[PDB]
Amino acid sequence: VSATYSVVYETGKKLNSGFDNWGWDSKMSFKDNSLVLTADPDEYGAISLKNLNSNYYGKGGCIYLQVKTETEGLVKVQGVRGYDETEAFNVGSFRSSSDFTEYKFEVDDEYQFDRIIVQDGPASNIPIYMRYIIYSTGSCDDHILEHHH
């Protein structure tokens, strides 16, 4: 099968149909035409974006998103088949940027997963602004947003 995409969030004030936030120690809000993670004061807080459309996003693949923030942190997966759902696996990091920066993270082929985690490493209580959160079953080498127009 060719690459299949799950578009979790583009812009606006809601997640797309069939996605929910199962994160912790944080508040997810919608401001500045983005999805915003603000970890609670002094907490290693996260959003965890659960796919309710299928039992999994897929096995391996690529996670793409854009981030704008003054803090930094980690992107992970959880709900991995074969594991306790609480166990999380790091797939990449994001850093501070004045405007939206694109990231692509390869998901190990060993991981068939149902949740995308974004987490504030410094426990900073600083907003992390996100757009265009998209999962592809294909490789990151084969993904580009310009082809999503």
PDB file of C-alpha atoms in Angstrom, residues 19-85:
ATOM      1  CA  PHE A  19      -8.784  12.484  17.649  1.00  0.00           C
ATOM      2  CA  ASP A  20      -8.692  13.268  21.364  1.00  0.00           C
ATOM      3  CA  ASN A  21      -6.129  14.490  23.901  1.00  0.00           C
ATOM      4  CA  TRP A  22      -5.246  11.901  26.574  1.00  0.00           C
ATOM      5  CA  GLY A  23      -2.269  13.881  27.947  1.00  0.00           C
ATOM      6  CA  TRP A  24      -1.362  14.790  31.499  1.00  0.00           C
ATOM      7  CA  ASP A  25      -0.171  17.600  33.778  1.00  0.00           C
ATOM      8  CA  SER A  26      -1.118  20.165  31.128  1.00  0.00           C
ATOM      9  CA  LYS A  27      -3.831  22.137  29.390  1.00  0.00           C
ATOM     10  CA  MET A  28      -4.502  21.970  25.655  1.00  0.00           C
ATOM     11  CA  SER A  29      -5.922  25.197  24.277  1.00  0.00           C
ATOM     12  CA  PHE A  30      -6.421  26.897  20.925  1.00  0.00           C
ATOM     13  CA  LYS A  31      -4.900  30.338  20.372  1.00  0.00           C
ATOM     14  CA  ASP A  32      -3.050  32.174  17.615  1.00  0.00           C
ATOM     15  CA  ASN A  33      -4.587  29.747  15.111  1.00  0.00           C
ATOM     16  CA  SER A  34      -2.687  26.816  16.588  1.00  0.00           C
ATOM     17  CA  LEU A  35      -3.052  23.908  19.005  1.00  0.00           C
ATOM     18  CA  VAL A  36      -1.318  24.927  22.216  1.00  0.00           C
ATOM     19  CA  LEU A  37       0.288  22.749  24.896  1.00  0.00           C
ATOM     20  CA  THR A  38       0.931  24.562  28.154  1.00  0.00           C
ATOM     21  CA  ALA A  39       2.363  22.222  30.809  1.00  0.00           C
ATOM     22  CA  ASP A  40       1.083  22.967  34.319  1.00  0.00           C
ATOM     23  CA  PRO A  41       3.494  24.950  36.508  1.00  0.00           C
ATOM     24  CA  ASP A  42       6.717  23.006  37.240  1.00  0.00           C
ATOM     25  CA  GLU A  43       5.398  19.861  35.493  1.00  0.00           C
ATOM     26  CA  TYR A  44       6.726  17.655  32.676  1.00  0.00           C
ATOM     27  CA  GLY A  45       3.365  18.039  30.988  1.00  0.00           C
ATOM     28  CA  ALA A  46       2.161  16.551  27.723  1.00  0.00           C
ATOM     29  CA  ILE A  47      -0.509  16.301  25.134  1.00  0.00           C
ATOM     30  CA  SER A  48      -1.090  12.755  23.857  1.00  0.00           C
ATOM     31  CA  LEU A  49      -3.151  12.681  20.687  1.00  0.00           C
ATOM     32  CA  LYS A  50      -5.158   9.454  20.528  1.00  0.00           C
ATOM     33  CA  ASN A  51      -6.538   8.066  17.266  1.00  0.00           C
ATOM     34  CA  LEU A  52     -10.169   7.021  17.798  1.00  0.00           C
ATOM     35  CA  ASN A  53     -10.755   6.302  14.093  1.00  0.00           C
ATOM     36  CA  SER A  54      -8.602   3.129  14.081  1.00  0.00           C
ATOM     37  CA  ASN A  55      -7.007   1.048  16.810  1.00  0.00           C
ATOM     38  CA  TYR A  56      -3.588   2.408  15.676  1.00  0.00           C
ATOM     39  CA  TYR A  57      -2.104   5.179  13.570  1.00  0.00           C
ATOM     40  CA  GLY A  58       0.094   2.505  12.016  1.00  0.00           C
ATOM     41  CA  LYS A  59       3.309   0.529  12.434  1.00  0.00           C
ATOM     42  CA  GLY A  60       6.407   2.634  11.852  1.00  0.00           C
ATOM     43  CA  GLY A  61       5.900   5.598   9.523  1.00  0.00           C
ATOM     44  CA  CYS A  62       6.500   9.315   9.962  1.00  0.00           C
ATOM     45  CA  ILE A  63       5.189  11.988  12.301  1.00  0.00           C
ATOM     46  CA  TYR A  64       5.193  15.526  10.841  1.00  0.00           C
ATOM     47  CA  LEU A  65       4.273  18.767  12.600  1.00  0.00           C
ATOM     48  CA  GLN A  66       5.143  22.440  12.831  1.00  0.00           C
ATOM     49  CA  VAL A  67       6.084  23.995  16.186  1.00  0.00           C
ATOM     50  CA  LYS A  68       6.591  27.606  17.369  1.00  0.00           C
ATOM     51  CA  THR A  69       7.754  28.058  20.962  1.00  0.00           C
ATOM     52  CA  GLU A  70      10.221  29.608  23.404  1.00  0.00           C
ATOM     53  CA  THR A  71      10.726  26.279  25.208  1.00  0.00           C
ATOM     54  CA  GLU A  72      11.829  22.829  23.932  1.00  0.00           C
ATOM     55  CA  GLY A  73      11.014  19.192  24.432  1.00  0.00           C
ATOM     56  CA  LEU A  74      10.278  15.696  23.195  1.00  0.00           C
ATOM     57  CA  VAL A  75       7.979  13.936  20.741  1.00  0.00           C
ATOM     58  CA  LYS A  76       7.101  10.345  21.631  1.00  0.00           C
ATOM     59  CA  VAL A  77       4.652   7.545  20.883  1.00  0.00           C
ATOM     60  CA  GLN A  78       2.688   5.423  23.354  1.00  0.00           C
ATOM     61  CA  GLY A  79      -0.106   2.825  23.204  1.00  0.00           C
ATOM     62  CA  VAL A  80       2.437   0.587  21.482  1.00  0.00           C
ATOM     63  CA  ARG A  81       1.284  -2.953  20.697  1.00  0.00           C
ATOM     64  CA  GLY A  82       3.088  -5.410  22.969  1.00  0.00           C
ATOM     65  CA  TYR A  83       3.569  -2.898  25.817  1.00  0.00           C
ATOM     66  CA  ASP A  84       1.780  -1.296  28.706  1.00  0.00           C
ATOM     67  CA  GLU A  85      -0.062   1.656  27.120  1.00  0.00           C
TER      68      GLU A  85
END
